[PDB]
Design a protein around this ligand. Structure first.
Ligand SMILES: [Ca+2]
Ligand SMILES: [Ca+2]
Ligand SMILES: [Ca+2]
Ligand SMILES: [Ca+2]
Ligand SMILES: [Ca+2]
Ligand SMILES: [Ca+2]
Ligand SMILES: [Ca+2]
Ligand SMILES: [Ca+2]
Ligand SMILES: [Ca+2]
Ligand SMILES: [Ca+2]
Ligand SMILES: [Ca+2]
Ligand SMILES: [Ca+2]
Ligand SMILES: [Ca+2]
Ligand SMILES: [Ca+2]
Ligand SMILES: [Ca+2]
Ligand SMILES: [Ca+2]
Ligand SMILES: [Ca+2]
Ligand SMILES: [Ca+2]
Ligand SMILES: [Ca+2]
Ligand SMILES: [Ca+2]
Ligand SMILES: [Ca+2]
Ligand SMILES: [Ca+2]
Ligand SMILES: [Ca+2]
Ligand SMILES: [Ca+2]
Ligand SMILES: [Ca+2]
Ligand SMILES: [Ca+2]
Ligand SMILES: [Ca+2]
Ligand SMILES: [Ca+2]
Ligand SMILES: [Ca+2]
Ligand SMILES: [Ca+2]
Ligand SMILES: [Ca+2]
Ligand SMILES: [Ca+2]
Ligand SMILES: [Ca+2]
Ligand SMILES: [Ca+2]
Ligand SMILES: [Ca+2]
Ligand SMILES: [Ca+2]
Ligand SMILES: [Ca+2]
Lengths: 347, 349
């Protein structure tokens, strides 16, 4: 096993296949209902096995999250097409979570620990209130996440409630914050009912025009600015991000942040991102090898690169074919301009 | 594209006749020192699960010549005595003349990430502006940096060899630039010791240093006042208890309230950094999501908020400081008073 006190599956059957007749009944039982929308299982032997692993994973997650009332069911895409269409499920292999009237999609690494950490954040309220100095400091240190902060009069303000409702659309991928403190608003240059949008790795936020905002206005603004120029590949978002390719390719950059050379290369990448942040056709994918250790060998074999050093290249999402910038020495890293010139030819 | 075990048998039991012949085969040799397998499902099974993990790691690290063997504590007690294996359940790694112990979460991804860092050279060279910046932003790791003339200096080589003792748990850095040394206030052959979450380093006395001087100084300062529980170090850290108890503080750093509480904890740690009876264990729930349910049930606490308490390592029993509101966090002084009462047995389990 993994160690002392790591949980083991108790054989109990908490995750079963869901039919439409029992939906409204199953839905009442839990705080959150997670539905694994899958394609009908082959008889084939090797897919049946690959599916069983996923259920085993869901079973373990259901066990450890039982006390927090999160239910897990499976939905056959073919046999239960009617239920799926009514709930709006159309992507197979995705885990849909029903939280109130809202629907959140999980499309990342199908592991027990990844799912649990993800769901634990999803349970809570999407908006964090920033009041103290250390809380302001906490907000300021968020770098690789899309974050929004608004200044409102109080929690009873209708303008805050609209901001809160908009936050529910993107939970927990995009972080929403709110303050009712004039001191904090002054420091963050926020006017009453004004909301600032922070793109990852950018120095200055964008004030959303024409305040105050309705729920729809905020959702629309975020959706139009939802793809950062430099975005990080996270295990809980990996397939969602990878399927969000631009013209069939990804500009992939490997950088181990804990490694001084990786940190070095990432900082140069940030500058490249800032210089071309207004390019809608450009989105650089930052992958920290430490977040995907079991894919390191695969990446080094497929991309023919050494992941002990920072790398950047262009990956074709159809056949996993790529060309990589020649960086044999991480003490002779390319400048922002040299990266840009190499990138410029890619576009 | 995540790998699955292909069924091949790469992890076998190692005997002493074949130790020499196996050691020559790999760049790194990992030996799982285990208790004797019994004639019970009591459990040959538990063991096999651990072997399955080792098999998957052996598969994905095959191209890098990383070997994995198993050492029976009974049948190979003499080899074990020769190699200095004495802890049951620990994974020992032979890197050249050195022996490194792994004593953390026995998972494939955890092991691979750990071993990948262990393969590389222990000392990172800090030269550029961004590299200096990279070193400075290291907060929760014990780190050392020294200023030397060059890589050919015997004083650097002593520093490098000393780094091999603690790889990859303690980070060693070196610079040969007077510009970096002036920024970091380093004199020639001087080495600064940075305790986690402290504002100021400690200049190791009596420079220059031999390998022995550095190793022994680190050993004397190897348990930080505020230390983080890491998956790859969790059991090593947990077994390093003081009087049967750990002062455990849960703080989700990504959460502003958890970040808030952690900063207060740093203040308490800095103010009481010279207390040898004090070592606070910081646990970020995001690093152990599969232990959240266990913790909430056993400790009777809400891990959606920052918590701090004293946990008894024998029966996992604990009492927790009352922080019902994370917008009314205790001050640094209130934390000290509560901690002092724990250390003085005024608050026990
Ligand atoms: Ca089942
Ligand atoms: Ca859709
Ligand atoms: Ca994992
Ligand atoms: Ca997270
Ligand atoms: Ca949380
Ligand atoms: Ca809060
Ligand atoms: Ca709502
Ligand atoms: Ca403004
Ligand atoms: Ca800024
Ligand atoms: Ca408006
Ligand atoms: Ca998908
Ligand atoms: Ca998707
Ligand atoms: Ca696509
Ligand atoms: Ca490096
Ligand atoms: Ca942009
Ligand atoms: Ca990691
Ligand atoms: Ca690493
Ligand atoms: Ca470098
Ligand atoms: Ca060059
Ligand atoms: Ca075997
Ligand atoms: Ca020992
Ligand atoms: Ca141990
Ligand atoms: Ca590394
Ligand atoms: Ca380096
Ligand atoms: Ca050596
Ligand atoms: Ca000094
Ligand atoms: Ca000396
Ligand atoms: Ca140990
Ligand atoms: Ca919170
Ligand atoms: Ca004091
Ligand atoms: Ca100390
Ligand atoms: Ca995590
Ligand atoms: Ca979290
Ligand atoms: Ca707070
Ligand atoms: Ca108080
Ligand atoms: Ca005091
Ligand atoms: Ca007791």
């Amino acid at each position: 096993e993994e160690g002392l006190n790591f949980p083991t599956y108790d054989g109990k059957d908490r995750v079963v296949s869901l039919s439409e007749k029992n939906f409204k009944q199953v839905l009442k039982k839990y705080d959150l209902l997670c539905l694994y929308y899958h394609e009908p299982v082959s008889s084939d032997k090797v897919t049946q096995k690959q599916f069983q692993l996923k259920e085993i994973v869901l079973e373990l997650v259901a066990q450890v999250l039982e006390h927090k009332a999160i239910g897990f069911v499976m939905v056959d895409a073919k046999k239960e097409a009617k239920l799926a269409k009514k709930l709006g499920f159309d992507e197979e292999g995705s885990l849909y979570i029903l939280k109130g009237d809202r629907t959140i999609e999980f499309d990342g690494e199908f592991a027990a620990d990844v799912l649990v950490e993800f769901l634990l954040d999803l349970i809570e309220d999407p908006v964090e209130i920033i009041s103290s100095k250390l809380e302001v400091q906490a907000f300021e240190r968020i770098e690789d996440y899309i974050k929004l902060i608004g200044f409102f009069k109080s929690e009873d303000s209708e303008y805050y409630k609209a901001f809160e409702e908009a936050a529910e659309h993107f939970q927990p991928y995009i972080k929403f914050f709110a303050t009712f403190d004039k001191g904090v608003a002054k420091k963050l240059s926020l006017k009453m009912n004004e909301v600032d949008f922070y793109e990852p790795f950018m120095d200055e936020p964008i004030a959303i025009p024409n305040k105050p905002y309705t729920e729809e206005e905020l959702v629309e603004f975020v959706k139009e600015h939802q793809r950062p120029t430099l975005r990080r590949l996270r295990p809980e978002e990996m397939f969602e991000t990878w399927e969000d390719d631009l013209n069939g390719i990804h500009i992939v950059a490997f950088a181990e942040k804990s490694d001084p050379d990786g940190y070095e290369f990432l900082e140069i990448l940030k500058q490249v991102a800032r210089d071309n942040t207004d390019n809608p056709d450009l989105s650089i994918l930052w992958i920290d090898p430490d977040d995907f250790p079991l894919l390191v060998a695969y990446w080094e074999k497929t991309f023919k690169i050494d992941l002990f050093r920072p790398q950047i290249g262009v990956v074709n999402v159809t056949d996993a074919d790529s060309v990589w910038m020649e960086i044999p020495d991480d003490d002779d890293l390319p400048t922002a301009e040299e990266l840009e010139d190499w990138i410029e030819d890619v576009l």
